[PDB]
Design a protein around this ligand. Structure first.
Ligand SMILES: [Ca+2]
Ligand SMILES: [Ca+2]
Ligand SMILES: [Ca+2]
Lengths: 66, 79, 68, 63
């Protein structure tokens, strides 16, 4: 009738398995955030360049209106 | 003997500790299951967001290309 | 079998494990919250950039006509 | 196993905690970048709209 220690051991085994899955997700999460952070940096440089081009183009266009 | 009361307290303590350990492992399962759900949601969102960022970068590339052309035309118009 | 000290020590170790798991749980919960919040920002960025692409595309088509 | 299982599982948890601590910091960095890009993208579309209008006026005047 020893079920207490039995369930306890089973629960711990289940927990250990899940922690393995949490490690799995944590590693993927980290790799993905690193990759996206680099992409966001690329995007930010491109956004800055485009804002400059648009600002310059509107100024140039403005000079030929009116 | 008089120690019977003490011995019963000891048994109750052993049972209490064992039970508390069991209850803790049950709480652990609830915690890791919720953690797993959170991790799953996080990966689902990161996947979606990564596709959005790819489209944003493509958009930045498109704007860059078009603005090079616009600048050429504006300079052509100016002189 | 299993002296009280062993039962008590195991209990202590189990509680320590639970506390570590609670800390881990809080990090997964916070991570999900942050990523969800960042999704709101990305939705806006994607919308704004896609519209900027459209506006620029139209603008360049008009500059092409202006030189014609 | 009791003692063994416990120490091993504690070590497993400690490792994921370590990974996640680093991950949270990386996501806080992502947060700063995205907040800035959110503002930049909104300003970008606004600037594009102004240019689009000016270009349309150029077309109306010169085409
Ligand atoms: Ca209880
Ligand atoms: Ca109970
Ligand atoms: Ca003309």
């Amino acid at each position: 009738g020893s079920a207490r220690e039995n369930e306890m051991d089973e629960n711990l085994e289940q927990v250990s398995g899940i922690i393995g899955n949490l490690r799995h997700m944590a590693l993927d999460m980290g790799n993905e955030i690193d990759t996206q952070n680099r992409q966001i940096d690329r995007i930010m440089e491109k956004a800055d360049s485009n804002k400059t081009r648009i600002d310059e183009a509107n100024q140039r266009a403005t000079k030929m209106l009116g | 003997g008089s120690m019977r009361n003490e011995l019963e307290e000891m048994q109750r303590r052993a049972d209490q500790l064992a039970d508390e350990s069991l209850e803790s492992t049950r709480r652990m399962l609830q915690l890791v299951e919720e953690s797993k759900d959170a991790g799953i949601r996080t990966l689902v969102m990161l996947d979606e967001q990564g596709e959005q960022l790819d489209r944003v970068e493509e958009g930045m590339n498109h704007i860059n290309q078009d603005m090079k052309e616009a600048e050429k035309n504006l300079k052509d118009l100016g002189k | 079998g299993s002296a009280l000290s062993e039962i008590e020590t195991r209990h202590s170790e189990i509680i320590k494990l639970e506390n570590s798991i609670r800390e881990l749980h809080d990090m997964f919960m916070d991570m999900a919250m942050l990523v969800e919040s960042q999704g709101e920002m990305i939705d806006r960025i994607e919308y704004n950039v896609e519209h900027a692409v459209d506006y620029v595309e139209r603008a360049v088509s008009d500059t092409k006509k202006a030189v014609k | 196993g009791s003692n063994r299982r416990l120490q091993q599982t504690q070590a497993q948890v400690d490792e994921v905690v370590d990974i996640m601590r680093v991950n949270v910091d990386k996501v806080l960095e992502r947060d700063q970048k995205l907040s800035e890009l959110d503002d930049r993208a909104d300003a970008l579309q606004a600037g594009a709209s102004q240019f689009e209008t000016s270009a349309a006026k150029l077309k109306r005047k010169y085409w």
